[PDB]
């Protein structure tokens, strides 16, 4: 239910982040604005 999760830069398709979430409370595919060091900017990181 509570699962460990690799996020991913939608552009680079690079994972770049590890995190946690419920599936009940956070069923929709999580997203954030996180730093991609390969681009050295901030970018929409989407769960995968």
């Amino acid at each position: 239910m509570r699962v460990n999760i690799t996020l991913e830069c939608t552009s680079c398709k690079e994972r770049n982040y590890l995190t946690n979430k419920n599936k009940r409370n956070n069923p929709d595919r999580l997203e954030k604005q996180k730093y991609c060091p390969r681009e050295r900017k901030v970018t929409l990181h989407r769960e995968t």
């Binding site: 239910m1 599936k23 009940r24 069923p27 929709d28 595919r29 995968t48």
Partner: protein
């Protein structure tokens, strides 16, 4: 075609709809693909289309067609939406529909004016027009009658190359299908044979499972008893190391080490026996995974003095005075079931609309309910349901507990109640509609094809319940066997 190590779960899911699936079929097998509601048949067809994010691996090198095709602009004409989905030959489609039973005038009507019968038939025409692609056929025989099913089975027997379909229709798959995938509970299975063979072999599996479980339970209880008794014996021997203070001389005991050694050997017997019991429990835990645990149902039938609940007199009904069936007179009394039947587009749902006053056509003849009569209602067009269930049951004045109870009795796992009706499978939406009906305190029940998108277990549940209670009901079905099991008052409307 190959599935390698596939795992998958929708974003909503707590659990894995698939966990390391490993199978292999081809374009040549006439394959069925069966399971209960909510197991992943349609999901799996999508994953074959690579329409979702499959973890693991899938191999194919072939073009697909998914029936039902996804359609927009339900307002526009049928010809328009069909051209928008896939181009084709108008005359070819006419040929297919006339080998089926519907006039091409339906093409130049709006797509929603049709019944589900003609919707299904026309999209099957679109299927049959295509030649090279690989058919994926999700529940074709639902919203369809004997003639359509017969001609479709004829086509699929004549079919040279392979296909895949999801049916829930036992005889229909038995006529045509060779290989079977079966999304059982907790695993996945592949056989060569028809659904009858699958029934037999799964019964054998369940028998074996239950018998072995009973063996293990019996033996483990035996071994636990014996372990406890050996243990008490050891303790009684340890008591011999010591005497009694009340009586003189009982002590001064010699070779307590040997006493304790022998007691230890007896405890070691007890422990060997306990370890055996634990191994047997480990064997037990592998069992009872592919079962269903069928359950009954209930029904909030609430009769009154009205021995006449509905009357119809000389009712001729249609649109634009193209009167749709010859005039009829009939009646629905208490504790009486009435099976209204006919072809597709014969006007059954139209009759229901005339009863409930929302008929946008032409009427001549009489149809009279009682004074303050309560209806429960299961329609052919339940798309309108939307949102969570704790809100559905507020829009529709219900008890949330009885609602979810009847759902779980129909066979929806309680992991699904957190989902939305937009997300649920068509069978699960259908179960929502049926559970609404069963939870509504009512005096007449009006069932417009409850049996389409359900499981064989659900067919059996409904038959057993309706034959047990025998309430007053109007019924519309194309599963003639079901209406034979229940009703004798059968009525065939026609033009």
């Amino acid at each position: 075609i190959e599935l390698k190590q596939l795992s998958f779960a929708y974003d909503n899911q707590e659990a894995l709809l698939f966990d390391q699936a490993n199978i292999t079929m081809d374009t040549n097998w006439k394959l069925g693909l069966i399971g209960r509601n909510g197991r992943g048949k349609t999901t799996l067809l999508r994953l074959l289309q690579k329409q979702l994010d499959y973890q693991g691996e899938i191999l194919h090198q072939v073009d697909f067609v998914y029936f039902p095709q996804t359609v927009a602009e339900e307002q526009q004409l049928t010809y328009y939406v069909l051209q928008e989905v896939t181009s084709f030959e108008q005359w070819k489609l006419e040929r297919e529909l006339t080998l089926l039973n519907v006039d091409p005038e339906v093409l130049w009507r709006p797509f929603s004016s049709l019944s589900g019968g003609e919707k299904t038939k026309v999209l099957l025409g679109l299927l049959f027009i295509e030649e090279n692609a690989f058919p994926l056929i999700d529940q074709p025989t639902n919203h369809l009658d004997l003639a359509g099913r017969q001609q479709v089975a004829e086509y699929l027997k004549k079919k040279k190359h392979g296909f895949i379909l999801v049916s829930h229709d036992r005889a229909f798959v038995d006529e045509v299908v060779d290989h079977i995938l079966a999304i059982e509970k907790s695993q996945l299975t592949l056989y060569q044979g028809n659904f009858s063979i699958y029934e037999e072999q799964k019964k054998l599996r369940d028998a074996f499972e239950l018998a072995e479980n009973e063996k293990i339970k019996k033996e483990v209880n035996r071994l636990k008893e014996t372990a406890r008794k050996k243990a008490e014996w050891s303790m009684n021997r340890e008591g011999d190391k010591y005497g009694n203070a009340k009586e003189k001389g009982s002590g001064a005991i010699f070779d307590t080490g040997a006493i304790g050694a022998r007691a230890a050997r007896v405890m070691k017997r007890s422990k060997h026996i306990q370890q055996r019991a634990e191994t047997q429990l480990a064997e037990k835990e592998k069992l009872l995974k592919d079962l269903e645990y069928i359950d009954s149902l209930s029904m909030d039938y609430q009769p009154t003095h009205h021995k006449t609940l509905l009357t119809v007199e000389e009712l001729r009904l249609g649109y634009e005075k193209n009167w749709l069936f010859a005039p009829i007179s009939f009646s629905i009394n208490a504790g009486e079931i009435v099976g209204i039947t006919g072809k597709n587009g014969s006007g059954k749902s139209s009759l229901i609309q005339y009863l409930l006053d929302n008929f946008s056509g032409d009427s001549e003849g009489e149809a009279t309910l009682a004074h303050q009569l309560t209806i429960s209602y299961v329609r052919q067009d339940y798309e309108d349901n939307q949102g969570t269930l704790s809100e559905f049951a507020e829009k529709n004045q219900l008890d949330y507990t009885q609602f979810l109870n009847n759902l779980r009795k129909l066979g929806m796992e309680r992991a699904v109640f957190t989902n939305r009706i937009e997300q649920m499978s068509m069978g699960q939406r259908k179960k929502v509609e049926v559970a609404k009906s069963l939870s509504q305190s009512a005096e007449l029940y009006i069932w417009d094809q409850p049996l389409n998108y359900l499981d064989v277990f659900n067919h059996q549940q409904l038959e057993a319940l309706i034959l047990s209670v025998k309430p007053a009901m109007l019924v519309i079905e194309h599963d003639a066997h079901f209406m034979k099991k229940i009703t004798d008052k059968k009525i065939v409307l026609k033009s």
